[PDB]
Design a protein around this ligand. Sequence first.
Ligand SMILES: *[C@@H]1O[C@H](CO)[C@@H](O[C@@H]2O[C@H](CO)[C@@H](O[C@H]3O[C@H](CO)[C@@H](O[C@@H]4O[C@H](CO)[C@@H](O[C@@H]5O[C@H](CO)[C@@H](O[C@H]6O[C@H](CO)[C@@H](O)[C@H](O)[C@@H]6O)[C@H](O)[C@@H]5O)[C@H](O)[C@@H]4O)[C@H](O)[C@@H]3O)[C@H](O)[C@H]2NC(C)=O)[C@H](O)[C@H]1NC(C)=O
Ligand SMILES: *[C@@H]1O[C@H](CO)[C@@H](O[C@H]2O[C@H](CO)[C@@H](O[C@H]3O[C@H](CO[C@H]4O[C@H](CO)[C@@H](O)[C@H](O)[C@@H]4O)[C@@H](O[C@@H]4O[C@H](CO)[C@@H](O)[C@H](O)[C@@H]4O)[C@H](O)[C@@H]3O)[C@H](O)[C@H]2NC(C)=O)[C@H](O)[C@H]1NC(C)=O
Ligand SMILES: *[C@@H]1O[C@H](CO)[C@@H](O[C@@H]2O[C@H](CO)[C@@H](O)[C@H](O)[C@H]2NC(C)=O)[C@H](O)[C@H]1NC(C)=O
Ligand SMILES: CC(=O)Oc1ccccc1C(=O)O
Ligand SMILES: [Fe+3]
Ligand SMILES: [Zn+2]
Ligand SMILES: [Zn+2]
Length: 341
Amino acid sequence: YTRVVWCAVGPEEQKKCQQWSQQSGQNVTCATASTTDDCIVLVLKGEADALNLDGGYIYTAGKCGLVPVLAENRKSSKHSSLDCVLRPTEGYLAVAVVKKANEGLTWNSLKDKKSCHTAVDRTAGWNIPMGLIVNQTGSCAFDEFFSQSCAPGADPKSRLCALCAGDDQGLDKCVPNSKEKYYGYTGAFRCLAEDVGDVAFVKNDTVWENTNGESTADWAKNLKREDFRLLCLDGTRKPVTEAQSCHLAVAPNHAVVSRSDRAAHVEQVLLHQQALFGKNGKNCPDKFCLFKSETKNLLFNDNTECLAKLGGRPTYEEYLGTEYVTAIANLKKCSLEACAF
Ligand SMILES: *[C@@H]1O[C@H](CO)[C@@H](O[C@@H]2O[C@H](CO)[C@@H](O[C@H]3O[C@H](CO)[C@@H](O[C@@H]4O[C@H](CO)[C@@H](O[C@@H]5O[C@H](CO)[C@@H](O[C@H]6O[C@H](CO)[C@@H](O)[C@H](O)[C@@H]6O)[C@H](O)[C@@H]5O)[C@H](O)[C@@H]4O)[C@H](O)[C@@H]3O)[C@H](O)[C@H]2NC(C)=O)[C@H](O)[C@H]1NC(C)=O
Ligand SMILES: *[C@@H]1O[C@H](CO)[C@@H](O[C@H]2O[C@H](CO)[C@@H](O[C@H]3O[C@H](CO[C@H]4O[C@H](CO)[C@@H](O)[C@H](O)[C@@H]4O)[C@@H](O[C@@H]4O[C@H](CO)[C@@H](O)[C@H](O)[C@@H]4O)[C@H](O)[C@@H]3O)[C@H](O)[C@H]2NC(C)=O)[C@H](O)[C@H]1NC(C)=O
Ligand SMILES: *[C@@H]1O[C@H](CO)[C@@H](O[C@@H]2O[C@H](CO)[C@@H](O)[C@H](O)[C@H]2NC(C)=O)[C@H](O)[C@H]1NC(C)=O
Ligand SMILES: CC(=O)Oc1ccccc1C(=O)O
Ligand SMILES: [Fe+3]
Ligand SMILES: [Zn+2]
Ligand SMILES: [Zn+2]
């Protein structure tokens, strides 16, 4: 009657999608691809309907016709009387994080160090820090800036993948999906935590959700926030409590996208699904919780409170904002209307 095919990236997302499919009585069904870009293509072909995307991918999807439908909303102190689904989004803070013990490392001495990125093309892990680095160095050779990195989605034989570890068997090194040990917000933070890299380009929230006992993961259980510092654009180092005055930029929240012609439909189904498996849902945590995967951020971020309606009914450019869009455009000149497929 009103059924939606979700696109999952990699085997772990596929498994979560299947459980959701099952519990939804197949109001939702699953398609799987190895990368986010491949999922976008399935959506364009009409073989999948939707998936939730980081803003860097929304820019890609947007140029090819896809539109934002609902956005991730997390916990807030302000707008509190308003229901989550109607509450305006706030965005997240992109930060650069280092170990306190790595003394004297600042924004201005990052050259030739080792970096941990969520994935190529993502907002906090790539577009913001590389855009800044390209601007302040006046060169498009962002591949020669760090000595070694893990940036999932880059050429596996390049320096940008040297620090990537692949899966439990060493396969799939540097793939941009959760099979890669250092992929995503959690993987990049882990890459820093294990001292594989000197700096991780993540979001403020990641630091908090993976320290001081907030995560039981064996690599994270003994991590304390005091052992980390944020790098500020002014060359200072600050504690992680100061992200409001020490971030690289404010990113637009991850959002669900779909083909324009399927948007109304996707929106209707998802609003019903979250009533069922969302934060206060009929069936979470009883049977299935859509916004939980045990700090793995599968399909949606684990800190998501709800998916919220947009309003003003954005175009992708308005959703991302003119500040962010010009940032991406300029970075992309190193590698304006065309379809990347
Ligand atoms: C970086 O990322 C991290 C991780 O995402 C961010 O940290 C997180 O922030 C949230 C809150 O923003 C944490 O949430 C929770 O903690 C709350 C505090 O214990 C819990 O209780 C409150 O929840 C309610 C929200 O609905 C709110 O309740 C009210 O607060 C009023 C004041 O704001 C209060 O009024 C009294 O307040 C004062 C008392 O001393 C007096 O001055 C006043 O006169 C008055 O008496 C009301 O009575 C009422 O209680 C309130 O906003 C609290 O948040 C809540 O249940 C929940 O558990 C979240 O845990 C936390 N994550 C982690 C891992 O720590 C961080 O903010 C980010 N940083 C940046 C810069 O963005
Ligand atoms: C790397 O460097 C790149 C080169 O600088 C950089 O590219 C871009 O950098 C600028 C930031 O986007 C951009 O400048 C524009 O400035 C104006 C911003 O004005 C509006 O916003 C302000 C918000 O802070 C408000 O205070 C003002 O009220 C104002 O509204 C542009 O907007 C105009 O706004 C007013 C209307 O109020 C009006 O006069 C205009 O009609 C228009 O609406 C203005 O047009 C500039 O575009 C700059 O153009 C752009 N540079 C290039 C070459 O594209 C990139 O951001 C850097 N990368 C990173 C990651 O930092
Ligand atoms: C599968 O989707 C359908 C459509 O939303 C759901 O069936 C609806 O049940 C509600 C609850 O009263 C009614 O308002 C609708 O009229 C029903 N739709 C029709 C006309 O078939 C069903 O709840 C969904 N199942 C799950 C588990 O998500
Ligand atoms: C509010 C929405 O339409 O757009 C924005 C929000 C912040 C900054 C810029 C924009 C915009 O449209 O450019
Ligand atoms: Fe992101
Ligand atoms: Zn700021
Ligand atoms: Zn508009």
